[model samples]
Target: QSNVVIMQDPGGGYGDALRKVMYDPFEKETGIKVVTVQEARSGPRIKAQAEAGKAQWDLTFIFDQETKLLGDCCLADIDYSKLSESAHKTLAAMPDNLKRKKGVALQVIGVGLVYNKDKFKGDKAPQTWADFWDVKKFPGRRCMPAWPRFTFEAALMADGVTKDKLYPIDMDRALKKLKEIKPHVVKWWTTAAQPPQLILDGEADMCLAYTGSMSKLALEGAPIDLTFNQGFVYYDFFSIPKGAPNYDNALKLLSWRLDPKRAAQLTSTFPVALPSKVVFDAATDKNIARYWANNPENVAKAIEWSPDFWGAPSPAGNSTNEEYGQEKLNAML
Candidate 1:
């Protein structure tokens, strides 16, 4: 008679593996009879669930921002206080904004600049954020995230917008720059896989894409290069709906998964890093640990995304998205 449903992104390798490792294991361990539902991202669905006054999901895995939104909406919250001492110690290490009562940091990912090493070889490879913006210097057709939100930020940065001054973005200015590069953008990619493929197929010179996807492709010999300079880092969080059918069971599942050893193990096998700060020996978590930026090298290259900046009144929010309408965007380019 258990009616717990676990909703998650039904995308590529990571999503599939999450359903297997997190979803299946919890169901078997608790006999809670977990059900899996797939969705794009949690924004719209969460709004719908809140409005309906009955959340269909008992637990949901979603992007960090969505977790933030849900936390604000009273739709979800994690009781980290009740977690084990090791888990609490781990959570303590995350930035304040990422720490949450109804949420737990599941993994860290970055939006990286990916280039085809084969096509852009010798002196042609891109290695920095400026390189992504420099068409004349780099001289190759470029592709960017079709989504306006991430693109707008990156565009502004490439156009000389410093990370400190990135919020309250000047849309007019960014659009003007994007217009200049429009002709050079032979393709605008939507899926995570497309950006790397664009490089592999030589469809375009470079693009902004998920690091994990690119890392997988690159490890498998795809002609890709990653530069973390000005790349955005994000945490994907695991949360449970406020009135979930099985909140207690879901919380138990959440706690079990956050164990330093477990999180590291999952990341190792999957080639991703769990956000827990607990120091597990990399050798034990080698698979996922190999890709982790906790090491000095990767850490130095990463730039943390500011949630406060994104949520600010002047920029990085819906207002910015609303400002650049189809008419405005088309008119610009």
Candidate 2:
């Protein structure tokens, strides 16, 4: 049995797409029974399996930073030397930032400003973090992440801090700026699902949300749109637990995903791009690709948070110092 654990289930749009494009095809080709377990809190669960000296999951989804934090303790080192020629070429061509000793990035996602296009209109939309704070100009309730990860960085950006100097954030200054917008925020969204829903439901005029989520809603005919200005990008990685029973099978499955054609198909269903060289011919994919390809300025303005900067000592060696940041944020609220 080849089992995989992921953040979403087969019922959702992304899960359904992957099943059709990658999972089912792989199963039929290999004659291996593929099972996907839906797990939201994968960090703690992966650690538990490692501690118990037994791992049920063959492949697991994890953040790129978590792979760095856990390293050899919870994640098995990927044997790139044993991969197929196509997989080897694909992996070799990827940027070093997207590859890790224990895992490889599965997809790239961004967090940025999303707004209701109908409400904001064309050129009048909020384009930057400072614009998100201008309630009088873009006057309506706004939504932001409940956590401190991107929220703190955005607050600092609104306070005039450049992207290059964003790290070791001035917590005091960010909190003070947050306090100013706190009254305008109708909802401090805890989940990725909320921001898009808030805009669609007419609860917020603007939000800081996952770019893919906004794109997903837009594809579904929602009035929402996104801006990459002052955005943040991070990679989600594919990792195998340290002692997974089906380690070899997991590696095989991982290799199957490295095919550029398959990777492009998966990206077509969702706006998240793969690191491979495969070109997506679909209109949405082309537009997204063109934006990232042509606009180096926008990419420069975006913050790429370092996993090392957020790292903290965990007894489990799976979680980040996100709690400490959240505590500071909580005190201010």
Candidate 3:
């Protein structure tokens, strides 16, 4: 055994929290060092390493779709039966579909509606996507994602499509509804950091923003608030690359991190969350729970991002849903 596991760093406050909660504890308990590389786009890199037969990373945080997209060739299959009892319980508790043959989703991320509290008082702020489009009732300069993945979903929800009925997204209907708010959007954010900047800069009063960024901002006295209601959520997966040097040890770390009690500690300190209720219910600071995608109440009304729908080829079977949707979306804009 190499007795060391190499993993990707989530970075920022989240990275520090992982070292404190997960890395340090795992190393102390198991005597296997946790070495982290600051890499976010490990999908292609993992494939490259696999082809080179020199997998440096034991496990990496890959795009949810990349698990299957590359699993057959570049990823190693997981043995769920090897997990500890508590991890097994937590794993079983997550939505069955979230478990893949070669990888699993452990972190939940949310993109939701956010508003400047300095602009809107009390509950007068927009809580749902429906209210987001109601300019007369809750008028403000708005910001939304430049990417079609989130933009179309928000537009559909604002158009009265329920969270569960969001798949096979009605591109024309969403486009039509977005036309109502197009002129009002002060900025169409292309990066995660832009939405909060637009709010703080007074460029936008209400916008679509990632809950993780909004949560940190609101905690540090930024006069902004966000709701998971009508928000769409997605996950990042944990996977082992095909030739990972510490494959067995990485599995041990995965099992350790998935244990509900340990995973709860990780969630409380970072905006990312685990799907386990014990983790949600154990919010060290109750407000921390509210700021994440996996809060049971928040999850109830939130839209689950459909990787399948967006991953597929478009109706024309030429461009992918991503390419096709963004093409139509940008043309309309």
Candidate 4:
């Protein structure tokens, strides 16, 4: 029973915020030290650690898609009864889709079109994913992820595909749309940090970036801005690894972070809100509140990244839809 919870963190602004807004206080008040390790995606790493039977991490923020892919083998079922009544109440008040036995998707993140306010201000700012590809309308160097899932979806969206009808993805049409803007892309971001860096460094004018990073910049006075409109919205499912060293401590930390008031505090600092209804209303930072994925208005316009679709086996069956989709997306790049 170690007095520490080894958690996975997706470094940069988000990581910094957790240490300051979530972990540090949890440690001081509870006397359970919190350690955060940086690994962009925890799915494979947790799988490997579980296979080895000497898991180093007690808790991790995994992808929503990963919750499905890893739930049976790598992840430990969350002991919901172990969490606080308030935390239970938080989940109770939310949608049925949010309720889960394997893991809880909490930290609501969005992938969307982001632009430098210094580059385009007010009425001229890009509003939708379609505008992301419209180099002619809002001419500026564009940046995007090297991965396919978000890019292909955004491509389809920009080509006039409604958010409600995104999948099983139309690869042929999406790639054709991607081909149109391929020439204008100045940078293809490989890391989570790259997209935001591109905009901040003035390397690219607009790009698809995680809202947490871009919002942190905007809050810090970096002229970076983003929208959830037609954006890809998903959560980081915080789960305990199958052989996590400190299981009880990990659950304790989970309950600690789920408090509505503290969840609001985290959002105020990092601009990344949880999926809780109370978290949205409890958030004190008006400068950043409207950007929240928790906002019904934002959720109304946002497209949920379908984990089932992405995690399913591809037509060829050699790899997952996520894998093969990336392969198809890579071909276009």
Best by TM-score: 4
Q: Write the per-residue lDDT of candidate 2 for residues 304-328, one digit (tens) a residue.
A: 7766666664333454556577777
Question: How does each model score on TM-score?
Answer: 0.81, 0.84, 0.77, 0.89
Candidate 3, TM-score vs. the true structure?
Answer: 0.77
Candidate 4 wrong stretches, greater than 4 Å: 284-288, 330-333
Evaluate model 1: give its TM-score. 0.81
**Best-to-worst ranking by TM-score:** 4, 2, 1, 3
Error of 4 at 185 (Å): 2.6
**Which scores better on TM-score, 1 or 3?**
1
User: What are the per-residue Cα lDDT tens digits for candidate 1 across 83-191?
Assistant: 7776666666656766667676667777777788887887778776677878888888788866555567677877877766766556787777787778888887666
For candidate 3, lDDT tens digit of each residue in 186-224? 887775557777888999999887888788888899998
- Which pairs of residues clash in candidate 3, taking residues 3 or more apart in a chain or in different chains? none
Residue 305 CA displacement from its true place in model 3, Å = 3.7
Each model's lDDT: 0.66, 0.74, 0.83, 0.82
Q: Model 4: per-residue lDDT, tens digit, 169-218?
A: 88788889888988999988776667777888899999887877887788
Which parts of model 1 have CA positions greater than 4 angstroms off? 1-3, 61-69, 81-97, 136-141, 190-193, 196-202, 279-290, 293-296, 315-333
Residue 310's lDDT within candidate 4 is 80
Instruction: Judge candidate 2 at residue 189 and give its lDDT.
Output: 76
lDDT-wise, the better of 1 and 2 is 2
- Output the worst ten-in-a-row residue range by lDDT, candidate 1: 318-327
Q: Higher-TM-score candidate among 2 and 3? A: 2
